[PDB]
Enzyme design. Structure first.
Site, PDB file in Angstrom:
ATOM      1  N   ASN A 183       0.994  -1.110   0.162  1.00  0.00           N
ATOM      2  CA  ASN A 183       0.146  -0.076  -0.191  1.00  0.00           C
ATOM      3  C   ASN A 183       0.973   1.245   0.151  1.00  0.00           C
ATOM      4  O   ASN A 183       1.864   1.262   0.658  1.00  0.00           O
ATOM      5  CB  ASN A 183      -0.939  -0.248   1.476  1.00  0.00           C
ATOM      6  CG  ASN A 183      -2.071   0.963   1.341  1.00  0.00           C
ATOM      7  OD1 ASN A 183      -2.572   1.292   2.243  1.00  0.00           O
ATOM      8  ND2 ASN A 183      -2.410   1.488  -0.089  1.00  0.00           N
ATOM      9  N   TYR A 194      -6.541  14.514  -2.669  1.00  0.00           N
ATOM     10  CA  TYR A 194      -6.731  13.955  -1.428  1.00  0.00           C
ATOM     11  C   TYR A 194      -6.153  14.709  -0.680  1.00  0.00           C
ATOM     12  O   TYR A 194      -5.411  15.490  -0.584  1.00  0.00           O
ATOM     13  CB  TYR A 194      -5.723  12.494  -1.659  1.00  0.00           C
ATOM     14  CG  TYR A 194      -5.388  11.842  -0.402  1.00  0.00           C
ATOM     15  CD1 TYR A 194      -6.585  11.116   0.266  1.00  0.00           C
ATOM     16  CD2 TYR A 194      -4.345  12.072   0.307  1.00  0.00           C
ATOM     17  CE1 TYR A 194      -6.187  10.518   1.543  1.00  0.00           C
ATOM     18  CE2 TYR A 194      -3.982  11.476   1.618  1.00  0.00           C
ATOM     19  CZ  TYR A 194      -4.970  10.800   2.117  1.00  0.00           C
ATOM     20  OH  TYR A 194      -4.581  10.024   3.192  1.00  0.00           O
ATOM     21  N   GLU A 244     -10.772  12.398   6.200  1.00  0.00           N
ATOM     22  CA  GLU A 244     -10.097  12.095   5.243  1.00  0.00           C
ATOM     23  C   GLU A 244     -10.871  12.327   3.992  1.00  0.00           C
ATOM     24  O   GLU A 244     -12.123  11.528   4.072  1.00  0.00           O
ATOM     25  CB  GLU A 244      -9.446  10.759   5.376  1.00  0.00           C
ATOM     26  CG  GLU A 244      -8.287  10.524   4.313  1.00  0.00           C
ATOM     27  CD  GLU A 244      -7.914   9.001   4.347  1.00  0.00           C
ATOM     28  OE1 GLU A 244      -6.578   8.676   4.346  1.00  0.00           O
ATOM     29  OE2 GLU A 244      -8.618   8.127   4.720  1.00  0.00           O
ATOM     30  N   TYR A 290     -11.754  12.310  -0.385  1.00  0.00           N
ATOM     31  CA  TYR A 290     -11.015  11.990  -1.874  1.00  0.00           C
ATOM     32  C   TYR A 290     -12.006  12.672  -3.041  1.00  0.00           C
ATOM     33  O   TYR A 290     -13.154  12.400  -2.796  1.00  0.00           O
ATOM     34  CB  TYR A 290     -11.150  10.569  -2.196  1.00  0.00           C
ATOM     35  CG  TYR A 290     -10.063   9.818  -1.155  1.00  0.00           C
ATOM     36  CD1 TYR A 290     -10.275   9.509  -0.060  1.00  0.00           C
ATOM     37  CD2 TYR A 290      -9.038   8.965  -1.883  1.00  0.00           C
ATOM     38  CE1 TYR A 290      -9.523   8.473   0.393  1.00  0.00           C
ATOM     39  CE2 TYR A 290      -8.040   8.355  -1.242  1.00  0.00           C
ATOM     40  CZ  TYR A 290      -8.237   7.985  -0.032  1.00  0.00           C
ATOM     41  OH  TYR A 290      -7.670   7.081   0.489  1.00  0.00           O
ATOM     42  N   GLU A 330      -2.658   6.535  -5.374  1.00  0.00           N
ATOM     43  CA  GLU A 330      -2.607   5.587  -4.270  1.00  0.00           C
ATOM     44  C   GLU A 330      -2.762   4.093  -4.852  1.00  0.00           C
ATOM     45  O   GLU A 330      -3.293   3.932  -5.992  1.00  0.00           O
ATOM     46  CB  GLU A 330      -3.792   5.790  -3.498  1.00  0.00           C
ATOM     47  CG  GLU A 330      -3.882   4.723  -2.194  1.00  0.00           C
ATOM     48  CD  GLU A 330      -4.919   4.994  -1.095  1.00  0.00           C
ATOM     49  OE1 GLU A 330      -5.195   6.218  -1.107  1.00  0.00           O
ATOM     50  OE2 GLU A 330      -5.041   4.104  -0.285  1.00  0.00           O
TER      51      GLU A 330
END
Length: 190
Positions: A44, A77, A86, A88, A177
């Site tokens: 990740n 982001y 958070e 997006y 990502e």
């Protein structure tokens, strides 16, 4: 140049690069707001350039190419504090739509496409302030693209209208990502 995880400023832009230490990712800061990332059987990771702090009315421009082979996203982001959120604004993705199983809280039309809005929750996950439980706000573009302009205000306003409020803005970047996949990307921010 090529660098290991960390944050800083490069050619007048804030940048953030992080990975879980699995290997298979190469992040390179280019001139101006350019950055490139090439990954092969990675873990990740998240990497991109932008601003620190972001604003609630920024018009973000991005130009480049994005070729994922597997699970990956290309989005605007960032985070907000108090409340900790958070968020997006997903412009493109790979094999997995991040809104899968998420609760749809509306639709917004901006910059040439309709976007579907969702809210999810992350429980005891890492965050900019340490392990916490927080919400995630998403705007997922129906018509995928790797270049364009994003009027963040249109999304932040629509979210607020639906009851998805944001606090004090933290960093705001255009990021790539990946989650255990392969791919390449070269993006220029402005």
């Amino acid at each position: 140049q090529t660098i290991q995880p960390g944050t800083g400023y490069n050619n007048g832009y804030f940048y953030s690069y992080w990975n879980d230490g699995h290997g298979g990712v190469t992040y390179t800061n280019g001139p101006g707001g350019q950055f490139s990332v090439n990954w092969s059987n990675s873990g990740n990771f998240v990497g991109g350039k932008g601003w620190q702090p972001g604003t609630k009315n920024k018009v973000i421009n991005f130009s480049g190419s994005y070729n994922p082979n597997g699970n990956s996203y290309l989005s605007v982001y960032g985070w907000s504090r108090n409340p900790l959120i958070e968020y997006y604004i997903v412009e493109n993705f790979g094999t997995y739509n991040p809104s899968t199983g998420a609760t749809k809280l509306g639709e917004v039309t901006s910059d040439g496409s309709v976007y579907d809005i969702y809210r999810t929750q992350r429980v005891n996950q890492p965050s900019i302030i340490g392990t916490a439980t927080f919400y995630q706000y998403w705007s997922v573009r129906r018509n995928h693209r790797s270049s364009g302009s994003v009027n963040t205000a249109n999304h932040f306003n629509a979210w607020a209208q639906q009851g998805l409020t944001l606090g004090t803005m933290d960093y705001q970047i255009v990021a790539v990502e990946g989650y255990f996949s392969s791919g390449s990307a070269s993006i220029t921010v402005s």
